[PDB]
Design an enzyme around this catalytic site. Structure first.
Site: not given
Ligand SMILES: CCCN(C)Cc1nc([C@]2(O)CN[C@@H](c3nc(-c4ccc(C(F)(F)F)cc4)no3)C2)cs1
Length: 330
Positions: A35, A199
């Protein structure tokens, strides 16, 4: 040193990709979701609440001769979908694709939220954003890449994700056979801890290119491409019957449609996402409404170049003193 590991979609939609990681001595192999949008390496473990484990492979630190409790350290994280996990921390030997880090912080889950439990194919996450986002307290820990960096031949890793197919994560070298043309590099801001870049614009299908700056993050852990509502509306307006559904949670389109491609700018270069990459299939089994792979970022607070975009490219995460991102067609 270098490492090279194959990453494989977890399902027929490319909802996520898993990569085998060796932890401990003797090795315990767990399939982790790499990730680039987070900075914690955490695993299902012998400490995870039993009712929250459903088919995952677990790390058992008591069976590793190299594991040591990182006394007093805890961690707790939430992700953009609302999921979360937390626990305590060991250090142990971690290897990816032949590249070994000794003393890596391995965050052992005591608790995971339901979406993790429900995904039996994901045994944990390996964060590759900047270590400033790592959640371990009271002593923040470094990512696997940050720990490996000084030993690598070049301070880089690359993501070469497949479309409905396996791909590759390489550490420490650029595989010049893995892409066509040249790699275009673009500046990264680390101010928010992400691989954040701008971008230069976009095109829909065969349309002309719209020059416009789109700040966003390169995030292998996000499935879809999240862009400003203006851009996303311009895309879906080209698909008969496509609409944003508040009940489903985003843009849906008739499964009878053939989708246009979507092009994004990297400097003066262009990456073309084929229309099929934007099709995430029926919203529920048997439905004729399909879920779109390009969605609005409104309400996330950040644009995200997730797997839909990254898998169209060979992507270099350059962790030199001045970090940059490179994109090439492939
Ligand atoms: C500045 C605002 C931040 N706000 C919170 C949006 C963002 N969010 C991210 C992530 O949290 C990091 N990269 C994604 C990511 N999600 C997962 C993941 C999630 C759930 C599962 C499951 F379904 F199995 F539970 C598996 C993998 N892995 O990576 C999102 C970066 S910015």
């Amino acid at each position: 040193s270098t490492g090279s590991a194959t990453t494989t979609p977890i399902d027929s939609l490319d909802d996520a990709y898993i990569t085998p990681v060796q932890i401990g001595t003797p090795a315990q192999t767990l399939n982790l979701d790499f990730d680039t949008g987070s900075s914690d390496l955490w695993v299902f473990s012998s400490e995870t609440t039993a009712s929250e484990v459903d088919g995952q492979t677990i790390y058992t630190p008591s069976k590793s001769t190299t594991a040591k409790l990182l006394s007093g350290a805890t961690w707790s994280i939430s992700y953009g979908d609302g999921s979360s996990s937390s626990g305590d921390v060991y250090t142990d030997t971690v290897s990816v694709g032949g590249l070994t880090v000794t003393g890596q912080a391995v965050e052992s889950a005591k608790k995971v939220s339901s979406s993790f439990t429900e995904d039996s194919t994901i045994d944990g996450l390996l964060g590759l954003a900047f270590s400033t986002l790592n959640t371990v307290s009271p002593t923040q820990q470094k990512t696997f890449f940050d720990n490996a960096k000084a030993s690598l031949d070049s301070p880089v890793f690359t993501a070469d994700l497949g479309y409905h197919a396996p791909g590759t994560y390489n550490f420490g070298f650029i595989d010049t056979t893995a892409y066509t043309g040249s790699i275009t590099y673009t500046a990264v801001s680390t101010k928010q801890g992400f691989w954040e870049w701008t971008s230069t614009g976009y095109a829909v299908g065969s349309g002309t290119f719209k020059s416009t700056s789109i700040d966003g993050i390169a995030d292998t852990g996000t499935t879809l491409l999240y862009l400003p509502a203006t851009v996303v509306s311009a895309y879906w307006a080209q698909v008969s019957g496509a609409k944003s559904s508040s009940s489903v949670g985003g843009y849906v389109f008739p499964c009878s449609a053939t989708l246009p491609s979507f092009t994004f700018g990297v400097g003066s270069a262009r990456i073309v996402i084929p229309g099929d990459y934007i099709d995430f299939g029926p919203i529920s089994t048997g439905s004729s409404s399909c879920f779109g792979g390009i969605q609005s970022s409104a309400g996330i607070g950040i644009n995200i170049f997730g797997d839909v975009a990254l898998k169209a490219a060979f992507v270099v995460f350059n962790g030199a003193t001045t970090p940059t991102l490179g994109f090439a067609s492939k």
